[PDB]
Design an enzyme around this catalytic site. Structure first.
Site, short mmCIF file in Angstrom:
data_model
loop_
_atom_site.label_atom_id
_atom_site.label_comp_id
_atom_site.label_asym_id
_atom_site.label_seq_id
_atom_site.Cartn_x
_atom_site.Cartn_y
_atom_site.Cartn_z
N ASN A 62 0.81 -1.18 0.00
CA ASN A 62 0.00 0.00 0.00
C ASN A 62 0.86 1.26 0.00
O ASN A 62 1.36 1.69 1.02
CB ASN A 62 -0.89 -0.07 1.24
CG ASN A 62 -2.05 0.89 1.07
OD1 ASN A 62 -1.89 1.91 0.41
ND2 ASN A 62 -3.17 0.48 1.66
N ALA A 85 0.02 4.14 0.09
CA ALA A 85 -0.50 5.18 0.97
C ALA A 85 -0.23 4.97 2.46
O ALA A 85 -0.73 5.79 3.27
CB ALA A 85 -2.01 5.35 0.78
N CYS A 86 0.53 3.98 2.81
CA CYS A 86 0.83 3.66 4.21
C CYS A 86 2.32 3.83 4.49
O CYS A 86 3.12 3.18 3.80
CB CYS A 86 0.42 2.21 4.48
SG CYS A 86 0.95 1.30 5.92
N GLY A 87 2.68 4.66 5.44
CA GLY A 87 4.07 4.90 5.74
C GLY A 87 4.77 3.62 6.13
O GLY A 87 5.93 3.41 5.84
N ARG A 147 5.65 1.90 2.92
CA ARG A 147 6.76 2.61 2.29
C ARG A 147 8.08 2.33 3.00
O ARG A 147 9.08 2.03 2.31
CB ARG A 147 6.49 4.11 2.22
CG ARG A 147 5.30 4.49 1.37
CD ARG A 147 5.24 5.99 1.22
NE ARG A 147 4.99 6.74 2.44
CZ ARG A 147 3.82 7.06 2.94
NH1 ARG A 147 2.70 6.69 2.34
NH2 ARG A 147 3.76 7.78 4.07
#
Ligand SMILES: [Cs+]
Ligand SMILES: [Cs+]
Ligand SMILES: [Cs+]
Length: 138
Positions: A7, A9-11, A14
């Site tokens: 994802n 959009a998820c730190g 990342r």
């Protein structure tokens, strides 16, 4: 060799992806929200992760809330089928390497299953130091 169910959009996701790359491999990236695992694959991931089905469920997303999944009224297979039908319920990231499979929450859990050491220091995107230049966990 290495797969991450990612994802962007998820730190946490990342940071995990960047730690993989810092070990010197580019993983296969599966955007699970669009390309979820098959049922058989999800069952195998959970087995290999050594956690419960409910421990993989992401709270605080629309299907979790509206289906009432906080309540203890669901079997493991009921929860698996909800995950397949609503992939945002699958917590993230899941990483598979030749050493094993982990739900990498927190992200530095991935260091357990990376075969090769981090190639230099690693600092999370929010500035939290993870490994120093010498390779020691902080
Ligand atoms: Cs699939
Ligand atoms: Cs390791
Ligand atoms: Cs954070």
């Amino acid at each position: 060799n290495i797969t991450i169910y990612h994802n962007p959009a998820c730190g946490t996701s990342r940071n995990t992806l960047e730690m993989i790359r810092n070990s010197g491999t580019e993983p296969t990236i599966i955007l699970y929200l669009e390309n979820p695992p098959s049922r058989d694959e999800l069952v195998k991931l959970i087995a290999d992760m050594g956690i419960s089905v409910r421990a993989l469920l992401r709270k605080n997303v629309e299907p979790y809330e509206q289906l009432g999944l906080a309540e203890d009224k669901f079997t493991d297979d009921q929860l698996i089928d909800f995950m397949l039908q609503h992939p945002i319920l699958i917590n993230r990231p899941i990483v598979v390497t030749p050493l094993g499979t982990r739900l990498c929450r927190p992200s530095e859990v991935v260091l357990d299953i990376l075969q090769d050491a981090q190639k230099g220091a690693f600092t999370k995107e929010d500035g939290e130091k993870v490994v120093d230049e010498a390779g020691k966990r902080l």
